[PDB]
Each structure stands twice: as C-alpha cells, then as structure tokens.
Design a protein around this nucleic acid. Structure first.
Lengths: 126, 115, 100, 136, 82, 100
RNA sequence: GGGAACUUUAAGGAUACUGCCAGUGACAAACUGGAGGAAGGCGGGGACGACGUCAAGUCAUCAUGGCCCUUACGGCCAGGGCUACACACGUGCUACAAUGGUCGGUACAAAGGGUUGCUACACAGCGAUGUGAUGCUAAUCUCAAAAAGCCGAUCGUAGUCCGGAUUGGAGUCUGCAACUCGACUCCAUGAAGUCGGAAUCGCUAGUAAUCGCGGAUCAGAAUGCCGCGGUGAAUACGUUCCCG
C-alpha cells in the first residue's frame, strides 16, 4: 500500500508496506534465508520493534547493490520512510530513534601519490 | 605402521599418514586409498594386516624413497657432468631457474658470508 | 511498423542535448510521435600524464574524456519526416546514426 | 590538538542487549573488520556463562568488569574513567587467548567465570598492577 | 618450452650445413651464431662452433646433448669470484 | 629520438605492410586441419623463412611528433610530453582536467 | 501481453542563509545549546600553489647559443649485455597459524575493458588449454567466478593437514625464435620462519586494518602504478619535550 526507498552505501531498497500479520519477504526469500548473521536481521527488525507493531504489517522488500550491512541499513531506512508515509505522526519517535537520517558516509577515493585514501608510503630520511 | 621402509604415524588419518613417505603427496595418497578401497578418514591404527598389505602393493607401484632419491641424484649428476648451464649453476650452488642473484638468493646460497 | 531509431554520440553534452532537441522539434513539426531523448550511460576514460620532463613520479596531470549518448525513437513517420531529417544540417562535434 | 578540543565518538549499542559495554568489548575483540567473528565469540561466551549459571549476562559482565577494573594503571600514574574500562577490557582479552579451551568463545567464557571468583589471570595482572602501584 | 605440436626448432642454414656434413663425412667444425637451434639426433658426432657473444666455442655433440639448445654449452658471462 | 631510429621504424612498418597477406595465408594453412601434415610442415618452414621485419612484434609505438618510445597512449598517438602540451592549450577535443 | 508506478540512467533545477528559539561576547567580531530538516555553522572529497628560495632537476621528449666528430663520436646487420654476485641499503609481497588450514553446501558489489577483440554453449583433458560453434561495434552479448561472509564436518598446538622458498620430471600458450632470459599447468620435493635488537614509519572515520575487482603500458610478460567497491575499529588528558 505505502512505499519507501532506503539508501546506504550504494545499496537501494524498495519497501512496500501494507496491513497484515507480520509477513516479511526480501527478494522472494525469508529474512533467515537472506541474512545469515543475526545482527543484520535485528537491524532490519528495529523499526517495528520500537513501535511494537511487528504483527500488524506485511512487508514486500527488494534490495540491490552494496553488501550485507549496507543492504540491512537501506532496508531499515526504507521501512522507516514507508512507516512515515503511512502515519505522519510517527516521525518524531523514529527521528529520536535515529532511523530517518540518511547515512551519507561513502568510500573515499584513492589519491595520486598515496597507497590509499589517506595511507602514505613509508618515509625515510636516509 | 611400517610401509615402504618407514614408520608412518598411526593416530592420523590414512591420507595424511601416507604423505610421510618420500615421493608420496596428497594426490598420490588419495589415489592409493581410492584404488585400495579404504576411506581417507580412517586412521592407520584401526586397519588390519590385509589392508596394510593391499596398501603396500599399491605403494610398490611408485618410486618412493631410495629409488627416487637415487634418480634425483643421477639427474643432477648428469647435468653437472655434461657441463651445460644448469650443470654449472648446480656446481656453483646458485639459482638454476633464472632468478636474480644480485639480491635474494639465500635459499641456494646459505647464510650470509661476511667479507 | 517503420520505426526510425536515431543514436547520437558526442564529447560535449550541451552539444548533444541541443542536437537532440532540434531533431525532436523537427520531427514534431512534421507531426510524428517521438519517444525520448533517452540518455544512455556515459563512458569516462581517464589518463595519468607525467608533467615533469625527467623524474617526478608523484607530479602528474589527470585528464578525462567523456562520451555522451542519446537515443531517439520515431514511430508512425509521415512521408515528410525522413526527408526533413535528411535535410537537417550536420553539426560539428556530434555523430548521428539513423537505422530504419 | 593544541587549540581544538575534539568530542569523543559515540558508538551504537549492540543489537542484542542494547549494552554499550558489550558493544565496546566486541569492538576490542574484533580484528581487521571481522565484526561477525567478534560477535560469534562474544555471544558464545555470554551464552556459555548463562547456561553455567542462570544469571543475566549483562549484569554478570558488568560485575566482572568492575572487579577487573583498575583504579590506577601499571611507574604509577592516574587514569580517568574511560581508561579504566579500556584497560579492563584490554587485560581481559589476553588471558582468554592464553587459556586452553578449543574455541575462543569457550576460552573467554572460562576466563570470565574464573575472574568473577578471583582466580583469573586478568586478576593476577591487576594484582601485578597494584603491587607495582604501592611502590610510589 | 616450445609446444610439441610444432616440433623442434632448427635454423634453416644450420640444418642445411648439418645435412651436408652428414651426407658427406667431413670433420671440420660448423661455425654458427644460431644459439637458439635445438640439437637433433643427427647432430651427434659433429663439432659445432657456437657463438658466445665474442668467440666461437667448439662443442662436440654427444648423445646426451640431444634435446638441448646449442647455446646451453656456450656460456656468455665471465665470473671468477669477488 | 635520432632520425635513424625513426627511419628504422618506418622501414619496419613498410616491411610489415608488404608481407601481410602472405604471412596470413601461411598461418591459415598451418592452422588448416584438412591440409596434410607435409603441407603444414612446409607452411611452417615458409613462415620461418620470411624476413624478420615482416613480423609485427618488432614494431615499437613511438610519438607521432618526436619519436619518443616511452609513454605512448595509443588513443592519442602521442607521448606524454607532447600530449600534456597539446591538451593544456585546447587542441585535443573533449579532453579536460579530471576531478572527482 | 502489457504498465510509466518504483529502482536506475542523465540533463536542468530547489535547498542552509546563524534561517528560528535559548544564553553569552562588548555595547562587536565571534562563541555555546536546542527544534525543524537528508544535511547546521567549512556536511565530505577533488582541482586550483601568491611575492619568492635552492647556479635544485631535465641539452636523453623537444627547441636552442657555444664547443667537438665527419670513410666516423654518422648509418646498416647477427650474436651477446642491460637479468652478473663474497656483500650493504631503500620500497614492497608472502608467512610464522586455531579470530586459522582443508573439504562440502550456500549469499551480497562498484568501476572499467571488448571487432587484427570479448566470447555463451558442446566435446576432449586432472589442468594450463584445444576444436566446433553462438551473440555482441554493446544499459542489448561478453570478461565474470566477486572474496572475505553464513551453515556443517575435520584438524587439536605439532615446524603441524601451518608456510610455500628451492629443486627433479612432464606439459600449454604468445611469439620467426622462450639457452643466456617469459608467463601459466600437473606430479614429486617441502627451505627459512614459532611474531622479530638499537631504532624507525603511516594513520583522527567510512579513516586505519583486512578482502576481492578493473585499467594504462602491452604479441607475451605486475607483488609496481592509477582506480573500484565489501566488512569495518581504537584513541586524543594536553603543549613541557622532539621536528619543521
């Protein structure tokens, strides 16, 4: 019914939220089947746990790009935006939780003359 | 257990124990075990005498210790006698396969020799 | 079902956009229905050029050149459409390819 | 930093117990970005101690960390509250590694269980610290 | 090494000289700069003077040399010690 | 580069251009299964009997302006020293300073 | 079949200005805190290098004053050398293991390259690879398998089922041609190494650490260089001391 888009480290999540009984599916897979480490699943579940509404909604989620952590963060962001697009009064609680903020940190480019973004080759006076 | 003249470990898996014989690696060990019919996770200490004889029969089909060391010695001696470039490298105890010698030849050279 | 497919390539995106807009307006004047212009992904080639004549490896200039691509689809072309498109002038710096 | 004073970084609580102490201990355990392995070790240790004694893992860990926590370091100096926890976790990490259980989670659970009753190598390290401290 | 599907490589001029000597039986050495040519079974019993960069070193080809390149028996660098 | 080196490269290029067809035919015959083993051997000998400069592995890319044999950049056909000078004054279309 | 919603692609725009609220500075410049907001005080990164210093570097990219050679200090060729080796130094790669090795099963990227090129698929081989064949001048086809990760089994602290140097044997490919002097594959071998003295280096956040992917040069030949993303920390009391 309601829609949300989440983004985190080149990962984008499309989230479709409707009323239901707690069904969840990501890329035609169960949460357990998609995320192996449990912390990612817990990150995915944070928004509804903080609202005590885990068994009141059905989620249809697709995600593309990034890694496991990035995709989990993007799914959380998309779920938060979909909840806000359903109930406008819910935004202050989710903002206090910190979910509405888009994490803008990204990989810094490698620079000429350096081994990495900041790492510099070993120096010697002699 | 004694196979091919050496005492391989008894408490290890057969596929690891058979590699203690000169001239037998992991691939050869798996080949021998598959040809005999023994699983690779079976320990040596829990094998019977008939199975040991069967394994010895297969081991006899490859050059293992004395014949193989002899063959390698003859191969090196032939080059050193012929006097080709590889024979000269073997005589001088220097790298044979084209590696640099200005630095990094310590495996062939031995410990550093102070001037 | 005679569809005209036009592909535009350039090193300058302002030039390519101007050419695409001119083509679309020329087709709409004749009265056909057009789809686009659709921007295809851009190619970026990078180069590292040493600036010192002899020895400064960390002193380099980094250059790039981009190739922009546009796609235009013309469906149900009027008889005047092909003639007008061929009569359209060739702007420098833009490559135009037409497939029927 | 001469002029500028920099704020301390704020870290998120761990997803399971919402405990910043557990999160920081996991960060200390983790090497080269393998937070999954660090989580496995820490959560295994907590489950092990919980099944050994039916006590809340957070309370047990905080009580043991307070027991190991030093009021002074090592040549005596003074330390601040943050350094207290940092050094407590630091010393707690090593003794588990030198233990002899088959997995790191089991080793760390055993080390915590032994330090809680006072017969721990981290406890011995703290004893070395304070018997060094009375020198001055 | 060179692929077996191609066969051994021998320079045409050196091969022609070897064939001429073997058709004849002359014992004078065959002078060559072809360090890269492979020693064939026909080479056995002949003296080849292989260039080594500054000189032509004589090599008397025996049976055990077959399968080697001619340059393996004429080293190019001089070293006696430091 | 010295003028002799440039003339040497020109001569090698001309020889490669001259012997291109015969070399391709010889290699095709070598790789031809239906041909007899004797024919393949004769083709191999014929290919080995060509002049050395007929082979293209002996060509070295040199700057089109100065003949420098290092830092070639096939796309522009210019070594780095001339590429920098020509780019920074606007004579190379589409190339700009790269930042990202 | 269809839809133009969403992701994306890529052009043009909007937004942040101490704007609002609460104290300070000085009655200022400024400073501190809070709400809203994706973002709050320069949000992050790149490019851009003042007047000047070092007779700094480059006559071997190129140009150019002067000097020097002219059957040679010019030009052509084959072979050799730039790859040597009692030693010393700089910059790196791989390890010394259990937060690991191996085996089986199973997930998630970004960027870039491709027509004398990349190749689906089938057959042959243990394999490098070979043969036939298909699509692609590319958001269309392809390089391509991401890897660390998760689940299960085993190994149980041993110079080991750690490590992968060296050497013997047998091969593939590029190339006219792999001896000096190529890369890769298979069997065998299995060195030093059990965490490194005096001393010394990098890094303040998506950074360090760690994991894989691509390109320029290029017939072939990267642990170098230039880029790309995945996972993802610790600590800053302060200016005595060391350096500029």
């Amino acid at each position: 019914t309601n829609y949300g888009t989440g983004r985190r480290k080149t990962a984008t999540a499309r989230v479709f939220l409707s009323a239901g009984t707690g069904k969840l599916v990501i890329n035609n897979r169960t949460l357990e089947q998609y995320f192996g480490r449990e912390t990612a699943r817990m990150v995915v579940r944070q928004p509804l746990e903080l609202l005590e509404a885990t068994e009141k909604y059905d989620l249809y989620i697709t995600v593309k790009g990034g890694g496991i952590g990035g995709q989990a963060g993007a799914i959380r962001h998309g779920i938060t935006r979909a909840l806000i697009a359903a109930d406008e009064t819910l935004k202050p609680v989710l903002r206090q939780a910190g979910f509405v903020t888009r994490d803008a940190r990204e990989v810094e480019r490698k620079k000429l003359g350096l081994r990495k973004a900041r790492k510099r080759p070993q120096f010697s006076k002699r | 257990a004694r196979i091919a003249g050496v005492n391989i470990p008894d408490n290890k898996h057969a596929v690891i124990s058979l590699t203690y014989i000169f001239g037998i690696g992991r691939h050869t060990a798996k080949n021998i075990l598959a040809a005999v019919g023994i699983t690779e996770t079976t320990k040596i200490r829990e094998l019977d005498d008939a199975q040991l004889d069967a394994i010895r029969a297969e081991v006899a089909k490859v050059p293992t210790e004395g014949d193989l060391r002899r063959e390698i010695s003859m191969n090196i001696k032939r080059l050193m006698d012929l006097g080709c470039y590889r024979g000269l490298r073997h005589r001088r105890s220097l790298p044979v396969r084209g590696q640099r010698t200005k630095t990094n030849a310590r495996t062939r050279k031995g410990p550093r020799k102070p001037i | 079902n005679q569809r005209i497919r036009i592909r535009l390539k350039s090193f300058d995106h302002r030039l390519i956009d101007q050419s695409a807009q001119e083509i679309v307006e020329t087709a709409k004047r004749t009265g056909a229905q057009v789809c686009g212009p659709i921007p295809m992904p851009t190619r970026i080639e990078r180069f590292n050029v040493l600036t010192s004549p002899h020895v400064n490896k960390d002193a380099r200039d980094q250059y790039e050149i981009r190739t922009y691509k546009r796609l235009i689809d013309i469906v149900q072309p009027t008889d005047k459409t092909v003639d007008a498109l061929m009569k359209l002038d060739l702007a420098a710096g833009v490559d135009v390819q037409i497939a029927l | 930093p001469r002029r500028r004073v920099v704020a301390a970084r704020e870290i998120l609580p761990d997803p399971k117990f919402s405990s910043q102490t557990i999160a920081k201990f996991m960060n200390h355990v983790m090497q080269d970005g393998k937070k999954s392995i660090a989580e496995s070790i820490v959560y295994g240790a907590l489950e092990r101690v919980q099944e050994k004694n039916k006590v809340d893992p957070v309370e047990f860990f905080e009580t043991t960390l307070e027991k190991v926590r030093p009021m002074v370091e090592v040549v005596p100096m003074e330390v601040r509250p943050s350094r207290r926890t940092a050094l407590a976790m630091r010393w707690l990490v090593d003794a588990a590694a030198k233990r002899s259980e088959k997995t790191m989670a089991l080793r760390l659970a055993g080390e915590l269980l032994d330090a809680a009753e006072g017969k721990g190598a981290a406890i011995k390290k703290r004893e070395d610290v304070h018997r060094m401290a009375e020198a001055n | 090494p060179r692929s077996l599907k191609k066969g051994p490589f021998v320079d045409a001029h050196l091969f022609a000289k070897v064939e001429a000597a073997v058709a004849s039986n002359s014992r004078k050495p065959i002078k060559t700069w072809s360090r890269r040519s492979m020693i064939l079974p026909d080479f056995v019993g002949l003296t080849i003077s292989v260039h080594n960069g500054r000189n032509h070193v004589p090599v008397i080809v025996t049976e055990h040399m077959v399968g080697h390149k001619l340059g393996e028996f004429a080293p190019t660098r001089t070293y006696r010690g430091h | 580069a010295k003028k002799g080196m440039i003339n040497r490269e020109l001569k090698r290029e001309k020889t490669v251009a001259k012997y291109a067809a015969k070399r391709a035919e010889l290699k095709a015959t070598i790789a031809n299964v239906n041909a007899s083993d004797e024919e393949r051997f004769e083709a191999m000998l014929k290919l080995q009997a060509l002049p050395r400069n007929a082979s293209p592995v002996r060509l070295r890319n040199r700057c089109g302006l100065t003949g420098r044999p290092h830092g070639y950049f096939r796309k522009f056909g210019l070594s780095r020293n001339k590429l920098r000078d020509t780019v920074m004054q606007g004579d190379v279309p589409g190339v700009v300073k790269a930042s990202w």
